[PDB]
């Protein structure tokens, strides 16, 4: 499976969460930023590796980061 | 069981219900009114058809390959040897077909129309109708070949090519208008 990690530079704009096509990320509460929410990645078994989240992120060098790893039928985007 | 008929507004015979493949209500001469004959006729129809299908490919394909014409084969090939050797080979096969098996009493009760020689499991009440219809087409064809053999005295590929080259000067009209 791919690995999605969130770093403390997040500003809780929710853009990555909106972008994700397989519901991997969600917003949980946090106190490290003004918006009082950070992104999190509970369902990384469903991550396809598209990197749409990283395209959405507006922080200078992203706060969300997808490290591609071992392939499964879920991550390989197979309908067969 | 809707089925089509061989002539527009006719009514089918009452013994032809559509119960069997490729029934089109066609028995004006009443040759299958008794059910046991209709059983044998059914086996015969499929078997004459299968043989006409083999025959018509056998007749056309060596002429396409330039190996000779089907009704002139007997001046290069001895008929009597061919027919002796063929009947020797065919006899136990035909025997077993009619018999129903290898045993003297039938025993291993097989279908003598539709044995199981089908590795692709393709057999349905539809493919049965396709087999019959292709066979009927081939029987009509082999009738054509024989009559054309006598009337035009050329091979069937030659007959086709003549019709294609000169459709008006090579057709049934022109060939029967002359003494032939």
């Amino acid at each position: 499976s791919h690995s999605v990690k969130i770093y403390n530079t997040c500003i809780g704009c929710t853009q990555c969460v909106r972008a994700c096509p397989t519901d991997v990320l969600e917003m949980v509460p946090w106190d490290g930023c003004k918006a009082g929410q950070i992104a999190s990645s509970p369902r990384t078994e469903d991550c396809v590796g598209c990197k749409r989240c990283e395209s959405a992120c507006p922080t200078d060098f992203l706060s969300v980061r997808v490290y591609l790893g071992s392939e499964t039928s879920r991550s390989m985007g197979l309908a067969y | 069981k809707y089925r089509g008929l061989w002539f527009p507004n006719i009514t089918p015979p009452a013994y032809l219900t559509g119960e069997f493949p490729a029934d089109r209500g066609f028995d004006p001469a009443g040759l299958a009114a008794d059910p046991k004959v209709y059983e044998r006729m059914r086996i015969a129809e499929v078997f004459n058809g299968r043989l006409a299908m083999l025959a018509i490919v056998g007749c056309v394909y060596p002429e396409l390959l330039g190996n000779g014409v089907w009704f002139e084969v007997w001046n290069k090939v001895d008929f009597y040897r061919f027919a002796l050797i063929s009947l020797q080979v065919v006899a136990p096969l035909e025997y077993w077909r009619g018999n129903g098996g290898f045993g003297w009493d039938g025993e291993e009760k097989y279908d003598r129309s539709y044995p199981g020689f089908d590795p692709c499991n393709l057999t349905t009440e539809y493919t049965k109708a396709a087999e019959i219809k292709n066979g009927r087409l081939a029987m009509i064809g082999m009738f054509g070949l024989e009559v054309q053999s006598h009337v035009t005295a050329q091979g069937p590929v030659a007959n086709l090519i003549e019709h294609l080259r000169h459709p008006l000067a090579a057709n049934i009209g022109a060939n029967l208008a002359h003494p032939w």
């Binding site: 071992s70 039928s73 390989m76 | -």
Partner: protein, 72 residues
Amino acid sequence: TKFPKFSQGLAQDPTTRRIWFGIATSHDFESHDGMTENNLYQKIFASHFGQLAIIFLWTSGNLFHVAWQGNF
């Protein structure tokens, strides 16, 4: 399936990727599963012997085919 046994990640892959990426990572010994420095140096040293033998067999075959089928 099983191949490649030096990579569990690849050997769980249900696609034809497993085969291709198994062949292409077979000699990269550091990246193999549970590789230690000791085991790494020992497989390098053996493979080195294997390369040497292949070179001596190659020369042996040039000599042989020229002695047998050539015009030296």
